[PDB]
Design a protein around this ligand. Structure first.
Ligand SMILES: Nc1ncnc2c1ncn2[C@@H]1O[C@H](COP(=O)(O)OP(=O)(O)OP(=O)(O)O)[C@@H](O)[C@H]1O
Ligand SMILES: [Mn+2]
Ligand SMILES: [Mn+2]
Length: 383
């Protein structure tokens, strides 16, 4: 529309002030108590302990994974998606890593029905581009160690190490170190939340060539049981200061404009000339509208097409490579032709199957077929 994803916000961020809330050891220990009771099953959580290989005090961290069901229940001790717990060298219990609260796509839950959002949220609405990769958490442990995790893990080429290597490069580029980053993040009591996007490491659906590749900072959260997240202009500033790639942002005051905007982009699945997987919308939510305490609250707007078709193509090719039956659920006749074109490309280049299995060549194979068909991915999806 007349709206533009932008990355020049970081300079209005000087008027704003980062939120800060310290950790209450008592609060944290009760949260861990309740988490361990849920791990002692017989809501349900699963706990995994990891060493922190570069921690000079041998810190360990405990990752808590809920299944997506439990987040729709009331009365959970926390709603973090991605949560890591620890004891410092002095025995203090702490949240080492806190992700976003599990958030949901439009119409996926009662709260993410458009009518529910109109009623129970207030603006302004932060429209943050949804980069297509894997989530990466970064924080600073008490002994100065820079902790890098994937959504539920941190050992070793794991996603978390690939994320860390990328962080090492960006910090080298700006002449800063991990230890300075760890001190800054602990100073803020915060987890940095980034999307790792690199076709050379792993392909997803949209492309990320050698430029464009790296860690896209889209969030900073307070390491506390409750959900408090930085406003996105403050995130973009932190990205600049610490060498992250920034996540594009639109701010729309009115919620009816948000719906119309998101629907317009959804016709193409593209915005400002670039393909876009979706938006994550950030605002304040009330238990019941009118007044009430407002807390931070996200919802997803994941554009259905042509990305569903691309995803079906990905899974159908893997099923072709493996011996399993390709699941054709949508875009029937064009997927018929895609699967025949793929079979021929595999016959003429037998090593593709191994590569495709390891998530290299997904995007190229799709784009080659669309070339052969002389179509844009959008029109192929619209058949
Ligand atoms: N601007 C953004 N704001 C929030 N999340 C983003 C953003 N851009 C990309 N993401 C990624 O989107 C994910 C949520 O959308 P997606 O549909 O990929 O969910 P998912 O991978 O099934 O994970 P979950 O089960 O945690 O929802 C986050 O885990 C995060 O890695
Ligand atoms: Mn999920
Ligand atoms: Mn994703």
């Amino acid at each position: 529309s007349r709206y533009k994803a932008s990355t020049d916000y970081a300079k209005d961020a000087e008027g704003l002030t980062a939120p800060y809330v310290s950790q209450d050891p008592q609060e944290t220990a009760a949260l861990v108590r309740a988490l361990d009771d849920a791990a002692k099953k017989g809501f349900s959580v699963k706990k995994t302990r990891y060493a922190v290989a570069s921690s000079p005090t041998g810190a360990e961290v405990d990752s808590w994974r809920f299944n997506d069901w439990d987040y729709k229940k009331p009365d959970l001790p926390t709603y973090a998606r991605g949560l890591f717990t620890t004891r410092t060298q002095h025995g203090v219990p702490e949240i080492a890593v806190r992700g976003y609260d599990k958030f949901f796509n439009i119409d996926e839950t009662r709260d993410t029905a458009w009518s529910a959002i109109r009623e129970r949220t207030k603006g302004p609405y932060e429209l943050t581009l949804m980069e297509n990769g894997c989530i990466i958490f970064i924080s600073g442990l008490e002994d100065g160690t820079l902790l890098v995790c994937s959504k539920h893990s941190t050992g070793d080429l794991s996603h978390s190490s690939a994320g860390e290597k990328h962080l090492e490069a960006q910090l080298e580029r700006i002449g800063k170190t991990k230890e300075e980053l760890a001190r800054e993040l602990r100073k803020r009591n915060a987890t940095a939340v980034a999307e790792l996007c690199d076709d050379s490491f792993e392909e997803h659906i949209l492309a990320y060539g050698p430029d464009k590749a790296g860690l896209y900072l889209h969030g900073i959260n307070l390491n506390i049981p409750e959900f408090i997240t930085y406003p996105s202009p403050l995130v973009q500033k932190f990205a600049e200061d610490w060498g992250f790639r920034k996540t594009g942002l639109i701010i729309i005051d009115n919620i009816d404009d948000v719906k119309a905007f998101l629907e317009e982009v959804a016709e193409t699945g593209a915005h400002d000339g670039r393909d876009v997987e979706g938006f994550v919308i950030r605002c304040k939510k009330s238990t019941n509208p009118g007044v009430g305490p407002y807390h931070d609250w996200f919802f997803k707007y994941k554009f259905e097409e042509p990305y569903l078709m691309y995803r079906q193509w990905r899974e159908c090719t893997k099923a072709l490579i493996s011996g399993k039956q390709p699941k054709i659920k949508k875009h029937v006749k064009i997927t018929e032709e895609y699967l025949l074109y793929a079979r021929k490309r595999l016959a003429a280049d037998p090593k593709l199957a191994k590569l495709y299995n390891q998530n290299h060549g997904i995007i190229k194979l799709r784009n080659d077929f669309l070339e052969y068909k002389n179509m844009k991915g959008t029109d192929a999806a619209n058949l």
